[PDB]
Symmetry: C2
Subunit: 73 residues, 2 copies
């Protein structure tokens, strides 16, 4: 749609996705909804327990733009 960082926040035991294909570094992650609304077919992703943090979807300094979901580009 016509045009934002997600920034959604995790608590200590909340799950999220690591995507090693899309991450800027190994400390980056995206929330489940952002994962599900993007294209990670064939990517090396895993479900992780975050230990807290915030979603990097839409932040080009933490996540590769081709890994953004449909709501954060």
């Amino acid at each position: 749609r016509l045009g934002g960082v997600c920034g959604s926040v995790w608590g200590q035991n909340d799950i999220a996705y690591r995507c090693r294909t899309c991450e800027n570094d190994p400390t980056c992650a995206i929330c489940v909804p952002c994962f599900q609304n993007g294209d990670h077919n064939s990517h090396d992703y895993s479900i992780i327990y975050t230990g807290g943090g915030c979603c990097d979807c839409g932040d080009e300094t933490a996540w590769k733009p081709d890994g953004f979901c449909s709501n954060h580009k």
Copy 2:
């Protein structure tokens, strides 16, 4: 907050949560964000691959109200 069913939709391989403590029946489920914004401490929950469907959070006919998240009550 002052006051809705979530209704968020899953694709075939999308994950969600089953909560056997909160479900109306074994076919009910809630989305990850709704799980994370509710209280399922001590509940018998699991991450599942949905096969598609929609989130039951906020629908008293599919999910026990004490299992609703903060955005759907």
